[PDB]
RNA sequence: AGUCGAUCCUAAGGGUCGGGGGAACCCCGACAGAUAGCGCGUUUCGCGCGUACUCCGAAAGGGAAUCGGGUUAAAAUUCCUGAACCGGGACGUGGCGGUUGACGGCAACGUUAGGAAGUCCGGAGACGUCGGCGGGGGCCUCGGGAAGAGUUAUCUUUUCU
RNA sequence: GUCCGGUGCGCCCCCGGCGGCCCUUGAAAAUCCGGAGGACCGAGUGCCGUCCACGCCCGGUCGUACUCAUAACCGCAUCAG
RNA sequence: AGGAUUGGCUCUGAGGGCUGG
RNA sequence: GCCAACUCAGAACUGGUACGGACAAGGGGAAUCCGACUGUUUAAUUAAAACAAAGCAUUGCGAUGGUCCCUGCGGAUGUUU
């Protein structure tokens, strides 16, 4: 039953001082630093996670470190808005423009009548 | 009364309950009348109205929420909208216009 | 009455072309053996023409009047029907058989692009050739 | 011979407000042309809890009148408002709960909250949970309006002052008994260091006029002068009366 | 480290300039060919020893070869 | 089985604070922890998030309401008065 | 010691310009005000944006990157060997697009690449406490195979590593 | 030789998803990623782009021994604190 | 408040998972 | 057919009635006084009936204001109503 010690001069069990126990090829246990759990991108409209993107630390998303396909979604507002939210936005835009046209033509007809 | 006619349609007519089925009937032109409750989301209501206008199908605004519409239909679940494919013994399609 | 017919303009609601405008080429109300659900073949705009103004030069006007088009089979539930109609003739250019191979798809897309650019240069169907803002 | 607690309050440094987790001041938009002449539409995006404040706050997003950007505001939430609701601010805004209107456009008997005192101050009156002001009458001659404040006082304000239709949300908070010191501790932990309170008669004479004596008692009238100097002005200050009603 | 699953790609990697050395390890059930490049060490696993001998014969003359 | 004759939810307080205060706070304890009908989606899924804040689990709408109830009594009266005034102004 | 820290960021707060006080040492602290500057193209000049602190403040908050194996009398994630990663710079080869700015999937979305300037928007960083349940890594634990060791007056295909 | 299996309200750590509590709702910034828009931009056997792969070069300053305690800190000490 | 029992040994009964039509 | 875990409940037999065999681990009851309770306090003679507390009541105050700090200028309550 080997007991372990911190590998760094951090001596307090804070969120940024997490570790895992790994068995080395030398037959001994040792600590290894593990990154804090991070939530991935989230859709502001629905509040649910954005699909197709892994949950990494902000610096792990850097272009030089992560492939483009991993940090992008091939759709309008891809990676920012969920599919359902984008569909709702498109439908709302179209219907609101149509109703604006209807209001304009109704006003023109009323003006012509009077 | 609208409720009595709806009950008669339920017991002797053909109908579909729900947004997806309502859109399907409007696309297929099988529906003859669309009923929308007050509870229906504004965007969904606008989309249903646009579909009905494209299909030349009448739309009736039920004087109640989805719960009341479901209760009037005789169901134990909420009904946001419904389509009347064929009124058996009722005359809603004739009375409403 | 049926409205999902050829020459009717639709709005793509899902997929990589969501928000783009398209015109129905062929309607499959009952679907097919592979697709039992109602779908249709459409020819949409992947790249809309840019704003053409007088102050721009002839080369700029020609470059900004370009159009790029795509051909796709789309479920009825994934398009928004509109009240507009596009009369460009694509029956002999775009068909289900075109999608069989990449070369046929590219040729049909190029021909449809030429026809759409001609119609846009004519000056009609302004709504179809302006992108939706959302 | 020692500075009393009430005196030590003014210097602060332990009696300052606890504002670390607050969401920023709640106020109307700055009065501009659109609100003075027409109306401007906003959309409620969030209803949030402001620590130390009973009333909830609403986040509202407006389209900037003359800049290409979003104008973000934090209003005191009126009861009945919800996320996704449209808010209209201006002289021509409709008379509906949540809208902000100039008092000149609010008919008599209406219920309003966060009422401005000076035109453009962005709201100072009737801001606490469950509180409201009532429009009494208008004076077209001098362009002033009379309102009834929550305390019952009647105040005259210029008719250009703005107010939000309806009453502040979160009403009825104070009716619930706390039942224990811990609840008060939690309540005042986010407000300021004003709890618990030690009675003056429990102190020694050196630090309070009520201190001292072989029995616990004030030893002199607890009503003090309005002009009594600090350190002597304790108890019931300038009381016109005492005891039960 | 990276693994090359084709002898053709292994030869292509060995032919490039930055290939420093080639190490051959003789295991019981297979033979491993390792090429040291600037960025990565490429290992090719050959199950049959006959093809391993053919590859060893096919190594470029100018590349150092070591046996493990 | 009937676990408590009359205490109900206030049984968590044991024998502290007095019977009258427990009875008084029982109303708030019941109301603030109950589910409320959602007008927007027609479901009994409205729960209190914080004092005066009521969110619906189903449709996600959040409403500003009473401290311990979704709708205070004065809210309905205020709505009626405002509606009457708006109708008078419009007429 | 490019990889462990300080160093960077900001927290409660601290220190300040101007202004206002002050006999003065000094006091308040962005509050009385022509802010620092920031982007594009260049005859280095022009154009466009520009709300008065770009300062200090955490070897437990946030945060770019390293792992075995070995080595000293005394150092090591720092030394040795091997094998990786991060930041920055500059080019060359090959590949990719031109329907000038890819393709596939009905869709959720997938593929190593696959235009773009002022301007604007979202997310991550980013968060309390208690209770149950579930998954993963390490440890503990039982059996068999083989290697060594302990007991063997008697028993022990058993005890230990 | 470093092999093949079992087991669990077991213990330490990490994670997921629900539920309870609040008149308590439980930091900011640096930094990184994505998106809306499309001014502007190229050629015919070469041009314009390219967050793709491979190849090339560089990476400053200071701390780093040891104790961390019934004698390496404080308590006048090799002090049962 | 007030009462009874508790060791060792030899048994008995109950409470599960995987595979196969 | 192949595996699997420790929980529970019974029945014989048996010992000098020993058996939660060490360890571990409430004494109980009938009343009076004070303080409701949890919490806090005189570091080094007082832990209490003292302080606090929820509850109850009173007083001032609508910002050109109430209370308070400051030599002055200006500040805390105040990201408040
Ligand atoms: K992706
Ligand atoms: K004094
Ligand atoms: K205190
Ligand atoms: K007290
Ligand atoms: K006294
Ligand atoms: K007394
Ligand atoms: K001066
Ligand atoms: K200053
Ligand atoms: K740090
Ligand atoms: K090493
Ligand atoms: K934090
Ligand atoms: K929780
Ligand atoms: K872009
Ligand atoms: K060291
Ligand atoms: K130390
Ligand atoms: K206790
Ligand atoms: K006590
Ligand atoms: K005590
Ligand atoms: K007391
Ligand atoms: K004041
Ligand atoms: Mg007394
Ligand atoms: Mg000066
Ligand atoms: Mg800085
Ligand atoms: Mg608990
Ligand atoms: Mg064990
Ligand atoms: Mg773009
Ligand atoms: Mg000393
Ligand atoms: Mg003064
Ligand atoms: Zn709802």
Q: Which two tokens stand for residue C28?
A: 């499959």
- H/E element, F38: strand F36-38
- What strand order describes the sheet that includes B14-17? B14-17, B81-86, B33-36, B58-61
Structure tokens at E63: 């590349």
Q: Which of residues 23-52 of A have CB within 7 Å of strand G? A: 23-30, 32-33, 35-36, 38-42, 44, 50-52
- Residue C8 makes CB contacts below 8 A (sequence gap 6+) with C23, C24, C81, C82, C84, C85, C86
Which residue among C14, C80, C133 sits closest to A83, beta carbon to beta carbon?
C14
Chain A residues closer than 8 Å to C83 by CB: 98
Mind giving me the DSSP string for chain B? -HHHHHHHHHHHSEEEESHHHHHHHHHHT---EEEE-TTS-HHHHHHHHHHHHHHT-EEEE-SS-HHHHHHHTT-SS--SEEEEEE-SS--HHHH--
Helical ranges in C1-45 per DSSP H = none
Cα A114 to averaged position of ligand 8 atoms, centre (Å): 65
CA closest to F13 among chain D residues: D179
Ligand 11 center–CA D51 separation, angstroms: 18
* Alpha carbon distance E11, C16 (integer Å): 41
Enclosing H/E stretch for F63: strand F62-64
Phi, psi dihedrals of residue F80, rounded to the nearest 5°: -65, -45
User: How many Cβ atoms from other residues are within 10 Å of residue D143's Cβ?
Assistant: 11
Those residues whose beta carbon sits under 5 angstroms from the ion ligand 6 are: D 216-217
For chain D residues 5-34, those near strand H by a CB cutoff of 7 A are 20-21
Closest-lying nucleotide for E13 based on CA to C1':
H54
Spatial separation of the C-alpha atoms in residues C11 and A80, rounded to whole Å: 21
Q: Is D72 left (phi over 0), alpha (psi -120 to 50) or beta?
A: beta
Closest nt to D185 (CA→C1')? H24
* 3-state SS, residue A12: coil
What's the gap in Å between the CA of A21 and the closest CA on chain C? 44
Strand J at less than 7 A from CB of D88: no
Contact between residue A41 and residue A79 where contact means Cβ atoms under 8 Å apart: yes
For residues E42 and B67, what is the distance between their CA atoms, to the nearest angstrom? Answer: 67
As a dihedral over the C-alpha atoms of residue D3, residue D9, residue D11, residue D13, rounded to 10 degrees, the angle is: 120
C14/A89 Cβ within 8 A = no
Give the Å distance between the CA of A9 and the centre of ligand 27: 29
Q: Which residues of F touch D81 (CB under 8 A)?
A: 63-64
Strands (E) across chain C are located at 8-12, 21-28, 39-47, 68-75, 79-85
Based on C-alpha coordinates, what's the Rg of chain F? 18
- What 3-state class would DSSP assign to C69? strand
Nearest chain F alpha carbon to D110: F82
Nucleotide nearest to D124 (CA to C1'): J81
Q: Tell me which of A85, A87, A95 to substitute to probe the interface with B (most B C-beta atoms closer than 10 Å).
A: A95
CA of D232 to C1' of G23 (A): 35
Distance CA A20 to C1' I10 in A: 51
Strand J bases, protein C-beta under 7 A: 36-38, 50-64, 66-69, 75-81
Residue C36 contacts B, CB cutoff 8 Å: no
Q: CB-based burial of residue C117 (10 Å sphere; 0-12 exposed, 13-18 middle, 19+ buried)?
A: middle
Is there an interface between C and F (3+ Cβ pairs < 8 A)?
A: no
Query: From CA A74, how far away is CA A84, in angstroms rounded?
Result: 15
Is there a contact between B43 and A99 if contact means CB atoms under 8 Å apart?
Answer: no
The position carrying tokens 């601010």 is D89
Helix crossing, E49-58 with E7-15: angle to 10°?
20
The residues of D between 214 and 233 with beta carbon within 7 Å of nucleic strand J are 216, 226, 228-231, 233
Interatomic distance F6 CA / J40 C1' (Å): 35
Structure tokens at A97: 């423009």
Determine whether the interchain pair C132/A90 forms a contact, defined as Cβ–Cβ distance below 8 Å.
yes
Q: What is the dihedral of CA E12, E16, E18, E20, to 10 degrees?
A: 60
- Smallest CA–C1' separation from A72: which nucleotide? H34
User: Rounded distance, CA D42 to CA D54, Å?
Assistant: 24
The residue of chain C with its CA nearest to that of B58 is C1
Nearest chain F Cα to B64, which residue?
A: F42
The Cβ of residue E26 has, within 10 Å, a number of other Cβ atoms equal to 11
Is the CB of D17 within 7 Å of strand J? yes
The reported resolution of this PDB entry, expressed in Å, is 2.1
Candidates A19, A13, A16; CA nearest to A32 is: A19
Strand H proximity: list residues 18-57 of A with CB under 7 Å: 18-21, 34, 36-37, 39, 41
Residue A17, number of CB atoms within 10 A of its CB: 14
Pairing assessment for the beta strands B58-61 and B33-36 based on DSSP bridges? parallel
Asked whether residue F59 is marked as a ligand-binding residue, the answer is yes
> What gap in Å lies between CA C120 and CA C113, rounded to an integer?
10
Q: Please give, one letter per residue, the 3-state secondary structure of chain D.
A: CCCCHHHHHHHCCCCCCCCCCCCCCCCCCCCCHHHHHCEEEEEEEEEECCCCCCCCEEEEEEECCCCCCEEEEEEECECCCECCCEEEEECCCCCCCCCEEEHHHCCCCCEEECECCCCCCCCCECCCCCCCEEEEEEECCCCEEEEECCCCCEEEEECCCEEEECCECCCCHHHCCCCCHHHHHHHHHCCCCCCCCCCHHHCCHHHCCCCCCCCCCCCCCCEECCCCCCCCCCCEECCCCCCCC
In the block, which residue shows the tokens 């630090």?
D207
In order, the DSSP letters of E22-64 are EEEEE-SS-EEEEEE-SS-EEEEEESSHHHHHHHHHHS-TTSE
* CA-wise closest residue to E19 among E5, E1, E34: E34
Chain B hits for C27, CB-CB cut-off 8 Å, are: none
Residue B43 C-alpha, separation from nearest chain A C-alpha, in angstroms = 6
Method: cryo-EM
What is the least distance, in Å, from the CA of F8 to any CA of chain B?
31
Residues 6+ apart with CB under 8 A from B95: B5
CB D28 within 8 A of CB D116: yes
Could you tell me if D22 and D190 are in contact, meaning their C-beta atoms sit under 8 angstroms apart? no
CB neighbours of F57 closer than 8 A, spacing ≥ 6?
F45, F46, F47
Taking the centre of ligand 1 as the mean of its atom positions, its distance from the CA of residue A42, in whole angstroms, is 14
**Lookup: nucleotide whose C1' is closest to D216 CA:** J50
Q: Which residues of C touch B28 (CB under 8 A)?
A: 29
**Long-range pairs, F71-74, Cβ under 8 A, ≥24:** F71/D79, F72/D79, F72/D130, F72/D171, F72/D172, F74/D130, F74/D167, F74/D171
Q: Is the peptide bond before D196 cis (omega within 30 degrees of 0)?
A: yes
F77 in Cβ contact with D171 (< 8 Å): no
């Amino acid at each position: 039953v080997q007991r372990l010690t911190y590998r760094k001069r951090h001596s307090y069990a804070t969120k940024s001082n997490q570790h895992r126990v790994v068995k080395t090829p030398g037959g001994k246990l040792i600590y290894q630093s593990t990154k804090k759990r991070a939530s991935g991108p989230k859709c502001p409209v629905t509040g649910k996670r954005i699909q197709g993107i892994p949950h990494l630390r902000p610096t792990e998303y850097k272009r030089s470190r992560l492939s483009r396909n991993r940090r992008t979604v091939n759709r309008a507002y891809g990676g920012v808005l969920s599919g359902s939210a984008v569909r709702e936005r498109i439908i709302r835009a179209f219907l609101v423009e149509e109703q604006k046209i209807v209001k304009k033509v109704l006003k023109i007809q009323k003006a012509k009548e009077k | 009364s609208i409720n009595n006619r709806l009950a008669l349609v339920m017991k002797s007519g053909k109908y579909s309950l729900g947004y997806k089925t309502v859109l399907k009937t409007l696309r297929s032109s099988k529906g003859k009348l669309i009923l929308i409750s007050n509870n229906c989301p504004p965007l969904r209501k606008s989309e249903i109205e646009y579909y009905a206008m494209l299909a030349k199908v009448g739309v009736h605004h039920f004087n109640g929420n989805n719960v009341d519409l479901g209760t009037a239909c005789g169901k134990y679940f909420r009904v946001s909208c419904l389509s009347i494919i064929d009124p058996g013994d009722s005359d809603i399609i004739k009375s409403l216009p | 009455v049926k409205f999902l017919k050829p020459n009717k303009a639709v709005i793509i609601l899902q997929g990589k072309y969501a928000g783009r405008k398209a015109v129905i080429i062929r309607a499959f109300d009952e679907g097919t053996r592979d697709r039992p659900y109602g779908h249709c073949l459409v020819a949409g705009i992947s790249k809309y023409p840019k704003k053409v103004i007088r102050k721009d030069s002839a080369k700029k006007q020609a470059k900004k009047s370009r159009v790029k088009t795509f051909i796709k089979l789309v479920n009825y539930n994934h398009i928004m029907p509109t009240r507009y109609t596009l009369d460009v003739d694509l029956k002999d250019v775009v068909n289900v058989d075109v999608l069989q191979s990449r070369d046929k798809k590219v040729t049909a897309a190029k021909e449809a692009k030429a026809r759409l650019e001609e119609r846009f240069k004519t000056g009609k169907n302004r709504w179809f050739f302006t992108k939706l803002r959302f | 011979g020692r500075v009393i607690r009430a005196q030590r309050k003014g210097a602060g440094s332990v009696f300052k407000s606890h504002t670390h987790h607050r969401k920023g001041p709640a106020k109307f938009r700055s009065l501009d042309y659109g609100e003075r002449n027409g109306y401007l539409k906003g959309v409620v995006s969030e209803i949030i809890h402001d620590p130390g404040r009973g009333a909830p706050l609403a986040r509202v997003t407006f389209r900037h009148p003359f800049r290409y950007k979003h104008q973000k505001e934090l209003f005191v939430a009126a009861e009945g408002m919800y996320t996704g609701q449209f808010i209209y601010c201006g002289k021509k805004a409709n008379l509906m709960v949540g809208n902000v209107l100039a008092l000149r456009s609010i008919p008599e008997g209406a219920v309003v909250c966060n009422v401005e005192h000076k035109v453009g101050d962005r709201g100072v009156f009737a801001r606490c949970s469950g509180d409201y002001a009532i429009v009494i009458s208008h004076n077209p001659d001098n362009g002033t309006t009379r309102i009834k404040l929550p305390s019952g006082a009647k105040k005259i304000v210029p008719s250009g002052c703005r107010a939000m239709i309806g009453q502040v949300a979160g009403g009825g908070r104070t009716e619930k008994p706390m039942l224990k010191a811990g609840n008060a501790y939690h309540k005042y932990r986010v407000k300021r260091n004003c709890w618990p309170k030690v009675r003056g008669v429990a102190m020694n004479p050196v630090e309070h006029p009520h201190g001292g004596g072989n029995h616990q008692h004030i030893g002199h009238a607890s009503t003090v002068r309005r002009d009594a100097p600090p350190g002597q002005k304790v108890g019931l200050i300038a009381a016109r009366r005492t005891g039960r009603l | 480290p990276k693994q090359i699953h084709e002898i053709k790609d292994f030869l292509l990697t060995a032919r490039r300039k930055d290939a420093r050395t080639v190490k051959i390890k003789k295991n019981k059930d297979m033979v491993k060919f390792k090429v040291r490049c600037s960025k990565y060490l490429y290992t090719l696993c050959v199950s049959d020893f006959e093809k391993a001998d053919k590859l060893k014969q096919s190594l470029p003359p100018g590349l150092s070869v070591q046996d493990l | 089985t009937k676990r408590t004759k009359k205490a109900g939810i206030v049984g968590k307080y044991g024998t502290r604070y007095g019977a009258s205060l427990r009875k008084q706070i029982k109303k708030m304890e019941v109301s603030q922890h109950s589910k409320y009908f959602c007008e927007f989606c027609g479901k009994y899924a409205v729960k209190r998030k914080a004092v005066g804040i009521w969110g619906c689990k189903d449709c996600g709408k959040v409403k500003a309401g009473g401290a311990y109830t979704l709708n205070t009594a004065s809210a309905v009266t205020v709505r009626s008065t405002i509606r009457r005034l708006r109708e008078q102004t419009e007429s």
